[PDB]
Amino acid sequence: MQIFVKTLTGKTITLEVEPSDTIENVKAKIQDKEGIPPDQQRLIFAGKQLEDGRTLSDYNIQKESTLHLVLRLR
């Protein structure tokens, strides 16, 4: 399915994913487009911080829905 990842910098990217994809897996695809290391990414959906080892289906993330990407640096 297609999902969207919003950076609060203003911009958005599309991602191509499966419901069984892990957040880890999503982070890797974000790094491929944005260059941000996975341990400096945090993803937010429906007011929850998403865990690395869990899947999109675990969080009821559906086609054309949107995740929010936040930086955790120092």
Author numbering: 1 to 74
What is the paper's account of this structure, in its own sentences?
We obtained crystals of phosphoUb and determined a structure to 1.9 Å resolution. The new Ub crystal form (space group P1) contains eight phosphoUb molecules in the asymmetric unit (Fig3A). Unambiguous electron density is observed for phospho-Ser65 in all molecules (Fig3C). The phosphate group forms a hydrogen bond with the backbone amide of Gln62, but no other contacts (Fig3D). Six of eight phosphoUb molecules form similar dimer interactions, where phosphoUb molecules interact via their Ile44 patch. For example, we posit that the minor species could be recognized by as-yet unknown phosphoUb binding proteins. It is also clear that in the major phosphoUb species, the main Ub interactions sites, the Ile44 and the Ile36 patches, are structurally intact and extensively utilized in crystal lattice interfaces (Fig3). The obtained high-resolution crystal structure and solution studies agree that the majority of phosphoUb is structurally similar to wt Ub. As crystallization of phosphoUb did not provide information on the more intriguing minor species of phosphoUb, this was further investigated using a variety of solution NMR techniques.
The covalent modification of Lys residues with the 76 amino acid protein ubiquitin (Ub) constitutes one of the most important cellular signals, most commonly targeting the substrate protein for proteasomal degradation. Most recently, based on mass spectrometry and following from earlier findings that PINK1 phosphorylates the Parkin Ub-like (Ubl) domain (Kondapalli et al, 2012), three groups showed that Ub itself is a substrate for PINK1, which phosphorylates Ub Ser65 exclusively, in vitro and in cells (Kane et al, 2014; Kazlauskaite et al, 2014; Koyano et al, 2014). We here show that PINK1 is a Ub and polyUb kinase and reveal wide-ranging consequences of Ub Ser65 phosphorylation. PINK1-mediated phosphorylation of Ub at Ser65 has dramatic consequences for Ub structure, and key processes in the Ub system, namely Ub attachment and removal.
